[PDB]
């Protein structure tokens, strides 16, 4: 079934964080607003509603989340560890890091900006989008990436983690170090 | 060897200490409506795990929070009350914490006996050759 | 090493996130009373063989003194 207004109230804390862990909810109403953090870990939710607003961070670790629609506003970070997300939509306003470890993610939006750290660890992604900007640490360990785009920006450390990079960006300014 | 018993039993001594501290924080936060970190505390549990990697030490793999819904109480005049007027309190269950308190103490003390038992065997093994 | 054939100890706890459909968490089939007895039996039997091995060396040492 689907979450109602009264069922929403029974999964909210004092400061306004929605906890849906292991709960049997399949879809959320459109134009959904959360006062604080949102947790949809281990949920059978396969799609996030259009116009979704989260006043905190989105937690979807080891969930069945697959599709996020554009226009979603997230003030905190996005944690989609172990979910079933295959692509990242364009135009997501993310106020924090993006953790996509152990996901079937294949494609990323062009010129994506991550205000925090980025993770593509053990993902089947084949190539990073052109003009990528990362303000934190980039972990690509165990992924299928082997060629970086012509231009990219990482303001922290770059962790190869084991994968072999052969074509480095022509224009790259690094605020940290590169680790294998 | 008999020294591996000390590593295995010693790991359980630390393991049961983690669960005791987690229970202590649960008992002390059973009536705390507010919390720094913008999160209404929820009951935490230490999930043990055998690290097979003969001798199988026990390791704490991380603390996990309770899945029970928070206890909602209608307190309309509280500053933390929502529009409907309900304030939410942690889902700490007193009875399970008391049961965890007993089990953690009983398991902690029986690991001391095994370490003591292995100590005597090593001392006798050293008396051979003298 | 062989695992025991005793059925796992089932506990009703629809709160642990690692539970199942019926709210059951299965726990190891370890019996404390049989572990205490094994601890007593293992320690005593281990130290008994220390005495036999230690006394065996004495017999070997006395053999070297034959004819002296």
């Amino acid at each position: 079934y689907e979450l109602d207004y009264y069922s929403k109230f029974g999964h909210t804390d004092n400061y306004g964080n929605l906890d849906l862990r292991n709960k049997p909810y399949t879809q959320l109403p459109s134009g959904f607003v959360v006062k604080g953090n949102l947790n949809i870990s281990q949920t059978p939710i396969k799609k996030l509603p259009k116009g979704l607003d989260v006043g905190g961070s989105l937690e979807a670790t080891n969930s069945a989340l697959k599709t996020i629609r554009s226009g979603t506003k997230i003030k905190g970070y996005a944690n989609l560890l172990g979910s079933k997300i295959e692509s990242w939509p364009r135009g997501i306003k993310l106020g924090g890091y993006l953790n996509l470890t152990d996901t079937p993610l294949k494609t990323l939006p062009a010129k994506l900006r991550v205000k925090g750290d980025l993770s593509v660890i053990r993902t089947p992604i084949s190539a990073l989008p052109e003009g990528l900007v990362v303000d934190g640490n980039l972990y690509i360990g165990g992924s299928a990436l082997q060629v970086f785009p012509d231009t990219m920006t990482v303001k922290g450390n770059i962790f190869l983690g084991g994968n072999k990079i052969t074509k480095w960006p022509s224009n790259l300014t690094l605020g940290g170090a590169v680790a294998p | 060897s008999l020294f591996n018993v000390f590593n295995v039993t010693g790991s359980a001594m630390s393991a049961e200490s983690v669960r005791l501290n987690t229970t202590s924080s649960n008992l002390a936060n059973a009536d705390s409506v507010s919390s720094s970190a913008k999160d209404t505390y929820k009951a935490r549990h230490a999930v043990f795990g055998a690290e097979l990697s003969d001798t199988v030490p026990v390791k704490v793999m991380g603390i996990v929070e309770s899945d029970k819904p928070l206890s909602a109480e209608y307190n309309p005049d509280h500053p933390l009350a929502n529009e409907e007027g309900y304030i939410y309190k942690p889902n700490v269950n007193v009875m399970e914490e008391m049961a965890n308190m007993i089990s953690a103490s009983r398991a902690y003390q029986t690991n001391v006996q095994v370490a003591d038992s292995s100590k005597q065997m090593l001392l006798r093994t050293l008396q051979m050759g003298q | 090493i062989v695992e025991s054939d005793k059925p796992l100890s089932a506990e009703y706890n629809p709160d642990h996130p690692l539970a199942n459909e019926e709210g059951y968490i299965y726990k190891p089939n370890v019996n404390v009373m049989e572990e205490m007895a094994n601890m007593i039996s293992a320690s005593r039997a281990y130290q008994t063989n220390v005495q036999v091995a230690d006394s065996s060396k004495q017999m070997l040492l006395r053999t070297l003194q034959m004819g002296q």
């Binding site: 862990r21 080891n62 750290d117 | 795990g49 793999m61 991380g62 603390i63 | 690692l18």
Partner: peptide, 24 residues
């Protein structure tokens, strides 16, 4: 890995991925 919902002891920062927990 192991448990899927372990916590993190580091203070919230919302910008750095917590490496305290086994994030795999």
């Amino acid at each position: 890995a192991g448990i899927p919902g372990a916590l993190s002891n580091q203070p919230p920062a919302d910008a750095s991925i917590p490496q305290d927990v086994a994030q795999m």
